[PDB]
């Protein structure tokens, strides 16, 4: 088994510990090696199971990567933030002019949209799919789709699969399979984008644990991370949006040399702010903070 029984113990601890505290539903994490493919840890909170879900804002980074690509975008670009329809697009703060790093920071659906847009419908189906979205784990089906498809909504993935995909942002884009099973490093991968463009999107979503980033409070002392948080109105067996909420994180760390990736999602929190996009950011912060310090991996900031 590719477990690690020490990083499995905390964090079904802090998986607890964030389910009690939020009085959620349920919760799970999975720790994967960025550089094997090895799921190190992967947890339930109540003999639960890991279900599907919508992404949300984790999809993001591979939309601005994409668009770095196409050369739709340069790494220094400014991006009109003003909210449009189609149907309204807005943001949780109107902004007239984002940074594709301010995009990621502040989260900007109106941002990654107007990129989705200004792209093939192919383009974004091409990326996700090369992260592995819409292909199975063996330890996802017009403008408002390409668009909703952007802040990942209109479709549903598993902890595992997403887990797969922070993976390959960690490893700079190399795809690797997840491994129950151990293995020896180095573990050959497929080139699925340029190592450059995973870096530098992987530099910008350091903004987003720190001050004015949604995802502050997973903060380490110590480390840069490069995460997304978000939350879904979770849907009911029909098409509407039922009052539950499933708080997630996504992310690689130490950011300047990523060793793990961890995804963190909280079923259905009933305490403070359930909807709220941050809800499940302390508990990765937790998870990543008691892993890189057990791993003893050397402080980043």
């Given at each position: 088994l590719s477990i690690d029984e020490r990083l499995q113990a905390l964090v079904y601890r802090e998986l607890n510990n964030a389910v009690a505290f939020n009085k959620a539903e349920s919760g799970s994490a999975v720790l994967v090696?960025?550089?094997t493919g090895e799921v190190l840890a992967m947890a339930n909170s109540p003999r639960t199971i890991t279900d599907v879900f919508e992404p949300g804002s984790t999809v993001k980074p591979m939309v601005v990567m994409t668009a770095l690509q196409r050369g739709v975008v340069r790494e220094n670009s400014v991006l009109?933030?003003?909210?449009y329809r189609i149907?309204?697009?807005?943001?949780?703060?109107?902004?007239?002019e984002l940074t594709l790093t301010g995009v990621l920071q502040k989260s900007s659906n109106v941002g990654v949209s107007k990129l989705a847009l200004a792209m093939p419908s192919s383009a974004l189906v091409d990326?996700?799919?090369?992260?592995?979205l819409g292909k199975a784990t063996n330890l996802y089906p017009s403008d408002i789709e390409r668009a909703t498809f952007s802040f990942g909504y209109g479709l549903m993935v598993t902890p595992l699969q997403l887990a797969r995909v922070y993976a390959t942002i960690g490893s700079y884009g190399i795809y690797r399979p997840l491994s129950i099973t151990k293995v020896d490093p180095p573990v050959?991968?497929?080139?699925?984008?340029?190592?450059?463009?995973?870096?530098?999107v992987v530099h910008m979503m350091e903004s987003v644990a720190l001050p004015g980033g949604g995802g502050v409070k997973a903060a380490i002392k110590g480390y840069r991370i490069a995460?997304?948080?978000?939350?879904?109105?979770?849907?009911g067996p029909d098409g509407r949006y039922i009052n539950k909420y499933i708080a997630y994180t996504a992310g690689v760390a130490p950011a300047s040399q990523p060793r793990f990736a961890l995804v963190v999602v909280i079923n259905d929190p009933q305490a403070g702010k359930y909807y709220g996009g941050a809800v499940?950011?302390?508990?990765?912060?937790?998870?990543?903070?008691?892993?890189?310090?057990?791993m003893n991996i050397e402080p980043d900031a």
């Open positions: 090696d960025v550089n009109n933030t003003i909210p149907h309204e697009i807005k943001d949780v703060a109107r902004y007239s990326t996700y799919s090369r992260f592995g050959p991968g497929e080139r699925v984008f340029p190592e450059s463009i995973v870096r530098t995460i997304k948080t978000g939350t879904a109105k979770k849907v499940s950011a302390p508990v990765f912060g937790a998870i990543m903070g008691g892993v890189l310090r057990t």
